[PDB]
UniProtKB/TrEMBL annotation, chain A:
Repeat region (CHCR), residues: 1-105
Sequence similarity: Belongs to the clathrin heavy chain family.
The protein's role, per its UniProt record: Clathrin is the major protein of the polyhedral coat of coated pits and vesicles.
Localization annotation: Cytoplasmic vesicle membrane; Membrane, Coated pit
Whole-protein coverage range: 1462 to 1626 of 1675
Taxonomic superkingdom: Eukaryota
Protein name: Clathrin heavy chain
Protein source organism: Sus scrofa (Pig)
Regions annotated as coiled coil: none
């Protein structure tokens, strides 16, 4: 349609913004070709939208990597956050420990604080000698653990008072 | 046009170049900054407040 | 004042008066909530942390170690605070093991 | 000696002379509590602690990490304890995890 032709134009015209609005406005096309055009169009935003529609096409493990190609200043991790899937923070955060850009690593551990075990945390702490934004990890860990122990107390107290009957 | 959007992305990247690869803590706060979104069902921490006093504004 | 049940000002004043800790002693025996936090915080505004052991000790019964650690690390204070944490882990670990016992008994009894 | 069923003399002899990991070699077989605490502390008196992570693990079964944290504080010592600290928390990690699990099971089955 005139719409899809104009989207191809914006691809040539190096326009992603209106191209983004339009590819939201319709689906009468594929995004694999859209991915190929965007990911190599010299704009960090073009490659951003390509990575976006990667997972949109059920195609993961490269979207975050695609943003890691261009959007290095945590803008890769910015959407690695919203990538919604686990099995990323382990290896990606280890790599991000390799290049000591811990400035963004706080956000990395933040986004996926939910799915963490302290084992690897002390591993990387005692390894990279890192307590900043790790002591707060300690604090949140104990806080959620305070919540644990206390709700456990609640539950067991209810159960015992019930069984007293 | 092409050069226009190109240099706009380049100066946005210059802002994105303002980092390594207090100042660091306000920088990560601006970097690690939550917002009242509707997807917080996973962990629901409170330390979102902490940065306001833990390292930033400290 | 505590006889008049008007606490937290008398002892608050004797803070400025009981340079011989006697506020801290009495703020301790006050037996009242949600204040020893800011009280000990003020106590950190000055450096009499020489005796902060008791300051945490007396009211340890009813604290939340979250902000405790927050500030201590903030103030970089594990020194002469370690024993507190060691006791903290005595306590919580006793908690977890006893509740383990209890729940295990529930599991063994629920056979029917 | 364990052939005679009288311990604490054999591994004590390892403490006498066979200290070169042989002290640990029979600390393993000692297999009983309320000795390894003080024996291991005395072991720490001399700086053979270098491998004290193993020296404690060789009889880890019934160790409570609280005294471990205490003595770690007493010498301000963390090496071959930072590992044991990872042990502590990871066993504790698994523990609280299975606890949360069992608790979920219980509260869901309470309805019926």
């Amino acid at each position: 349609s005139v719409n899809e032709s104009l989207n191809n134009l914006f691809i040539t015209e190096e326009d992603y913004q209106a191209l983004r609005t339009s590819i939201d406005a319709y689906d009468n096309f594929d995004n694999i070709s859209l991915a190929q055009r965007l990911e190599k169009h010299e704009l960090i935003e073009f490659r951003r939208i390509a990575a976006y529609l990667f997972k949109g096409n059920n195609r993961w493990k490269q979207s975050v990597e695609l943003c890691k190609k261009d959007s290095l200043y945590k803008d890769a991790m910015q959407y690695a956050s919203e990538s919604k899937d686990t099995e990323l923070a382990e290896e990606l955060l280890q790599w991000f420990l390799q290049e000591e850009k811990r400035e963004c690593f706080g956000a990395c551990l933040f986004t996926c604080y939910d799915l963490l075990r302290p084992d690897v945390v002390l591993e990387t702490a005692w390894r990279h000698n890192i307590m900043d934004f790790a002591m707060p990890y300690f604090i949140q860990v104990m806080k959620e653990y305070l919540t644990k122990v206390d709700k456990l107390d609640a539950s067991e107290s209810l159960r015992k008072e019930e069984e007293q009957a | 046009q092409v050069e226009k959007n190109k240099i706009n992305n380049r100066i946005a990247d210059k802002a994105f170049y303002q980092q390594p690869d207090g100042t660091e803590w306000e920088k990560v706060a601006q970097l690690c900054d939550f917002n009242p979104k509707s997807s917080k069902q996973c962990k629901d921490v409170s330390r979102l407040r902490s940065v306001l006093m833990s390292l930033k504004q400290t």
